[PDB]
A paper describes a structure:
Enolase (2-phospho-d-glycerate hydrolyase, EC 4.2.1.11) catalyzes the conversion of 2-phosphoglycerate (2-PGA) to phosphoenolpyruvate (PEP) during both glycolysis and gluconeogenesis in all three domains of life. Enolase is a metalloenzyme activated by cations of bivalent metals, such as magnesium (Mg2+). In the present study, we purified enolase-1 from Chloroflexus aurantiacus (EnoCa), a thermophilic green non-sulfur bacterium that grows photosynthetically under anaerobic conditions. Each monomer of EnoCa contains an amino terminal domain that consists of a three-stranded β-sheet packed against three α-helices and a carboxy terminal domain that consists of an eightfold α/β-barrel; both domain features are typical of the enolase superfamily.
High-resolution crystal structures were obtained for the apo protein as well as proteins with 2-PGA and PEP bound in the active site. The enolase crystals belonged to space group I4, which contained two monomers per asymmetric unit assembled into one homodimer. The structure of the apo protein and that containing 2-PGA (2-PGA EnoCa structure) of EnoCa exhibits the so-called “open” conformation, where the L1 loop is away from the active site. In the beginning of the apo EnoCa structure refinement, the difference map peaks were refined placing Mg2+(I) atom in coordination with Asp241, Glu285, and Asp313, and then three water molecules in an octahedral manner. The nature of the metal ion could not be unambiguously determined from the metal–oxygen distances of between 2.4 and 2.5 Å. Hence, the octahedral coordination sphere, the presence of Mg2+ in the crystallization buffer, and the fact that Mg2+ is the natural ligand of enolase, is consistent with the modeling of the difference density peak as an Mg2+ ion.
Numbering used by the authors:
A (entry chain A): 2 to 41, 43 to 159, 163 to 199, 207 to 213, 215 to 250, 252 to 253, 255, 257 to 263, ...
B (entry chain B): 2 to 41, 52 to 157, 161 to 197, 206 to 213, 215 to 250, 255 to 258, 260 to 263, 266 to 300, ...
The structure:
């Protein structure tokens, strides 16, 4: 009944218009689960996604080989397998591959089947995905990290500036607050002549505009709205700031200063990718009052995570599904971090209409989600609205409790 | 079994982050149909989303519509839609809201399709629904913010399938970015009015494609927004002779709102090109049956842009599509500024419409393209891409 009867994949497009894999898992019950994998990519020591390299189709970005790995290899191995056994399924996919970075079948083919199987099974038990995945205690709505301003790589003259509606009584209220501030920040930028807005800018100017946008929308900094930053220090690191004309210990000094002036609750990649020495020093200085998130620093790798847990290098990790390659290994990484860091479930640049991360964040009661501006790549914000509604009296918005501060 | 048991609405966000209505219809079979209907019933409460809230349309669904339709057979689309029209009792669906009526109308069709275990295009169109549309892919912009002409679209007419045609357009979209670098939706760089066309023509041949034979241009100059003052410096009969010149030099297959909202004399004059070009009425027809029938007898255009949200119901939309089609015109189904809903992909195949205007290949737009890919695959051998057969010349 929850036994797999068919596995089929197809080449669809992502939010950037690039090919991506969509997997359908059909059970003996008639239930079909469908998953779209965020694509992205021939580099780095992490789970690798299979791209075609046929330059006569989508400039080599095709995904027909990952499609073939699903339609032939995975289908032949997994037809008759019980889809309700998530862990066993995932270890059957990992073993069928045989490579430590999912390079033979593709991390995109493995994740697609892993996610589609979970959805098929959820629909067979007649359960929503968050409940099927996390059981009876899945009820916490995350505080979103809402992108309102861009920079660095996307600037003309620190990469991301986000707002977090901590003070909201529900996700529905929190989303509205953030949407109202986003719309107000458009006016604030326009009446000064300049996912989120990326204009020519000091490094203090974006924080000032955001403070004005929070205030003019009618919200209280600190109490209601807080700032989460992703300067992406790996992008500006041969030992570090062109916008300020200056050149690891001194970078910490800049962050302590800024955190004391602005209501910054979280800082992601505040120090570079392999600057393990500096990361530990940043925790001793800010860790007690600021969330320090490892993105390029931890690359959702459990070995790097355990090293940073032991070294006391951060207190939060950014979780990316496509970097791990299976649902079981993602849940394992979320749990490892949580048992006392925060796990921040994040979307990808090459995302889709697929809303799995909205259910995954509630299933694990993660407390925080990292999505873009409230402007469809939105579907995730709508899923969280549907989940909060469905949970009724049982729903709880994380709020301040989202933070291990 | 297909009898309605519950009708539920909620306020969600649209692709612009504006509140919109999402309606769920539940049948006695346990099947649920869900639809998102973006707005152009608006709240006007300034202490919520700066008055753009849709709580009143949500209340119209959860109370008025739910009480009146619980127990109604969802499989009877026409009767359900005339029950909605009668409950509202206003010519422009102003009591309950067009968004409230469309939401229930679409969600009821989806609930019923799922109860019969049928994909929406087959449930809506029957056994002959199989024609994949030629997309009007927006690759270049102008006019306003989100040259004098608002939209520049490519059409992969020469493709053997929708899958192939989608790849062509996507490749040309990416190639045009590399050409703009060497000088909402499509690229909008400030610029001669012939330059966008020459840039598009360069991107076509640089991607490895042939104009006319494989790729054709479709235009939405939206001349109604400039009423003709082409502030090129120029200042109706001349405008007609201007488009004649373009068609002669460039592979333009279609022209939308080539003349003003109410320039009926000129619309009927452009006889001048009606024979070699598709002339689309957007602001000129505003999807109204009364105005559409007027332009049919007048021979003022040979195509109508279909906006589901402007019509308000599924039955009235199919009615408007059929009227245009059976009078020799093409019906071009179009998107809106505001969601993840992919109904128009199933609606375009259900009616074998041959063309879709759903924007740049970049989730609100991509989701519709993905639905068309799933539809083509599901049809298998039965599928047919319209190609040149999409056009009435
Ligand atoms: Mg990051
Ligand atoms: Mg138009």
């Amino acid at each position: 009944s929850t036994l797999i009867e068919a596995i089929v994949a197809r080449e669809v497009l992502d939010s950037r218009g690039n090919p991506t894999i969509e997997v359908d898992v059909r059970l003996e019950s008639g239930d079909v689960g469908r998953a779209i994998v965020p694509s992205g990519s021939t580099g780095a020591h992490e789970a690798l996604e299979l791209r075609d390299g046929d330059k006569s189709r989508y400039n080599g970005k095709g995904v027909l080989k990952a499609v073939q790995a699903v339609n032939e290899d995975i289908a032949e191995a997994l037809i008759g397998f019980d889809a309700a056994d998530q862990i066993a399924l995932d270890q059957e996919l990992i073993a069928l591959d045989g490579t430590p970075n999912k390079s033979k079948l593709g991390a995109n083919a493995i994740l697609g089947v892993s996610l589609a199987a979970a959805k098929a099974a959820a629909a067979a038990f007649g359960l929503p995905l968050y409940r099927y995945l996390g059981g009876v205690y899945a009820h916490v709505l995350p505080v979103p990290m809402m992108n309102i301003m861009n920079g660095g790589q996307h600037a003309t003259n620190f990469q991301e500036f986000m707002i977090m509606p901590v003070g909201a009584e529900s996700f529905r209220e929190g989303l509205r607050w953030g949407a109202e501030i986003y719309h107000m920040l458009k006016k604030v930028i326009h009446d000064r002549g300049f996912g989120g807005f990326a204009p020519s800018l000091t490094n203090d100017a974006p924080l000032q505009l955001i403070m004005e946008a929070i205030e003019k929308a009618g919200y209280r900094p600190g109490e209601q709205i807080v700032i989460a930053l992703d300067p992406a220090t790996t992008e500006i690191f041969d030992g570090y700031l062109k916008r300020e004309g200056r050149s690891s210990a001194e970078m910490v000094d800049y962050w302590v200063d800024l955190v004391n002036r602005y209501p910054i609750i979280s800082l992601e990649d505040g120090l570079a990718e392999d600057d393990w020495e500096g990361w530990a020093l940043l925790r001793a200085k800010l860790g007690d009052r600021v969330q320090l998130v490892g993105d390029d620093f931890l690359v959702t790798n459990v070995q790097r995570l355990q090293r940073a847990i032991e070294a006391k290098a951060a207190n939060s990790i950014l979780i990316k599904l496509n970097q791990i390659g299976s649902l079981t290994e993602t849940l394992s990484a979320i749990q490892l971090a949580q048992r006392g860091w925060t796990a921040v479930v994040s979307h990808r640049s090459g995302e889709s209409e697929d809303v799995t991360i909205a259910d995954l964040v509630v299933a694990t009661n993660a407390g925080q989600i990292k999505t873009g501006a409230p402007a469809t790549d939105i579907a995730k914000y709508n899923q969280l609205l549907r989940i909060e509604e469905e949970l009724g009296s049982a729903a709880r918005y994380a709020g301040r409790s989202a933070f291990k501060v």
